[PDB]
Amino acid sequence: DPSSINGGIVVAMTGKDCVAIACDLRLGSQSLGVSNKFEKIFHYGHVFLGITGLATDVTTLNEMFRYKTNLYKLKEERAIEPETFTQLVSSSLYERRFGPYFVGPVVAGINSKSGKPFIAGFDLIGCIDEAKDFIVSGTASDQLFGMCESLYEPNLEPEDLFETISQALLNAADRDALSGWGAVVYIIKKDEVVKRYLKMRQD
């Protein structure tokens, strides 16, 4: 199936006045690993989007959303919020109901007005996972579910959230042949965003 040709994973988690989102770096073609630097996480203003699945669609969706959000900012005269972007992603996906993009997007961000952390996931045709502890996606989503349900607890400080989402991603990835090969982690607060590249197994 198309959603397991290139491989890769995304996970997002909420913490106290923070959210985090993470992904691996792999792009392969079946068993052949090809790119060691294929990030799966993008941002439009202060809203983050991670995307797993077919790499060509990952790239396409990014461009589509940069396009849509840029127009939004121009017309609305303010940058899009995570809640609103979430609906936009959903309807964009559903528009292709019968010829869908083979993706599993994930949204993370902090609403500029409430200061409230927000995450969501989607199936390939736009169904929204409204859950607000963690969201997982990709070829190691089973592993991720297991890691998150285990390691997660609510209202982690950013420094602690960083360890949690890191260990969830790293350990899930090492049990998946199609994921891994590097990772990036974003810790997102109101006034600061920190990106980090994790050290992991290279097999």
Partner: protein, 246 residues
């Protein structure tokens, strides 16, 4: 008729738009007043027969839960714009974002609709001007006029139609940037009272406000994050109440 019927004349003016405005200037007065905690829009309900029931018609229309409109000029042009405006709010905004459009963008869509009638082949421009009152989370309360040309301007207060010159004048004197909705309602009434020839009660006046959220108009409980609509039209009773203790 596959050619524009609005064209430029040697003075550079566009006749059909001007004549559209003339129709507007001929219409019954209507007005809008923006307060610090709300906006009011108002018009007179001239019944073209006493056997007619004016309640069955509505010159003030809800567009979204937070946005309403009133008009001067040709009523049927207005009615049709109202239908189009409600639909475009769903088709170009709510179905994409799951949110109602903010006022200025909805005003902008209606402006497009009107601009198009002044350029497309085989059609006359709309013969109305709208006043549109709204609220949205990031801009607060606003008030716009759209003209037959598709031009729109934001107002603190204004009047349109027949008695608009005197009404704009009255409004210039009484308006300040600290009116509360109740002041704005009161002033709107006093203003409409000049324009009104004939009867003047809660039955010949239409009046709506964009103000606080009304949870009691939601129709359901249980989603606490769910905001009531800010738009409310005043009853005949409510309008008479204010009129006696004017």
């Amino acid at each position: 008729y596959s050619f524009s019927l609005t064209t430029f004349s040697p003075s550079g003016k566009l006749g059909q738009i001007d004549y559209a405005l003339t129709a507007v200037k001929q219409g019954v007065t209507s007005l809008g007043i923006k307060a610090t905690n709300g906006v009011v829009i108002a018009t007179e309900k001239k019944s073209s027969s006493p056997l007619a029931m004016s309640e069955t018609l509505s010159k003030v229309s809800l567009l979204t839960p937070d946005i309403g409109a009133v008009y001067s000029g040709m009523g049927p042009d207005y009615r049709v714009l109202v239908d189009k405006s409600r639909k475009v709010a769903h088709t170009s905004y709510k179905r994409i974002y799951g949110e109602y459009p903010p006022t200025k963008l909805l005003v902008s869509e209606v402006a497009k609709i009107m601009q198009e009638a002044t350029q497309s082949g085989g059609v006359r421009p709309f013969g109305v001007s709208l006043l549109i009152a709204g609220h949205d989370e990031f801009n607060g309360f606003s008030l716009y006029q759209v003209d037959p040309s598709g031009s729109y301007f934001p107002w603190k207060a204004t009047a349109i139609g027949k008695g608009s010159v005197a009404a704009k004048t009255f409004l210039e004197k009484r308006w300040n940037d600290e009116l509360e909705l109740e002041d704005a309602i009161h002033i709107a009434l006093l203003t409409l009272k000049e324009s009104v020839e004939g009867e003047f009660n809660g039955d010949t006046i239409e009046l709506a406000i964009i103000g606080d959220e009304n949870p009691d108009l939601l129709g359901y409980t249980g989603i606490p994050t769910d905001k009531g609509p800010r738009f409310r039209k005043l009853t005949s009773q409510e309008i008479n109440d204010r009129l006696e203790a004017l």
